[PDB]
Design a binder for this molecule. Structure first.
Ligand SMILES: COC(=O)C[C@@H]1N=C(c2ccc(Cl)cc2)c2c(sc(C)c2C)-n2c(C)nnc21
Length: 127
């Protein structure tokens, strides 16, 4: 069994910038979710080998995790807030696509996703 390579977190070909909205995504949004008691499954890519999930990367073709998002934000990988918000959404959606309603991991993602929506609701206007 093998895991795919993780999503990239550095690419000199990719346009990027800092924006006050990206700063909020790191300092408020990512920091809030990262410290949550249910963050830990989401702090790195799914290890389909150790977890014995050989079908994971057949069903989830756009993997994403908060370890990758945190690196992307600390490395200033994004051009805009929407790119980063779409990474969070891909992470939650992947969890709901692979798992069953009411599974623990789905309750975990729902708790993180509730906080994420409450914080993104107050994304600042772009300076
Ligand atoms: C049988 O299905 C699973 O094991 C799916 C797996 N559940 C789990 C999981 C995580 C937490 C609990 Cl309480 C139960 C299952 C999982 C991860 S990553 C990781 C380190 C684990 C242990 N996960 C994510 C993220 N998305 N799906 C999963």
């Amino acid at each position: 069994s093998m895991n795919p390579p993780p999503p990239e977190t550095s690419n000199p070909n990719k346009p990027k910038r800092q924006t006050n909205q990206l700063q909020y995504l790191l300092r408020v949004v990512l920091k809030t979710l990262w410290k949550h008691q249910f963050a830990w499954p989401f702090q790195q890519p799914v290890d389909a080998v150790k977890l014995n999930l050989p079908d994971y990367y057949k069903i989830i073709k756009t993997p994403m995790d908060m370890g990758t998002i945190k690196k992307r934000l600390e490395n200033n990988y994004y051009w805009n807030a929407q790119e980063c918000i779409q990474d969070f959404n891909t992470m939650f959606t992947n969890c709901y696509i692979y798992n069953k309603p009411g599974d623990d991991i789905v309750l975990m993602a729902e708790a993180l996703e509730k906080l994420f929506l409450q914080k993104i609701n107050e994304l600042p206007t772009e300076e």
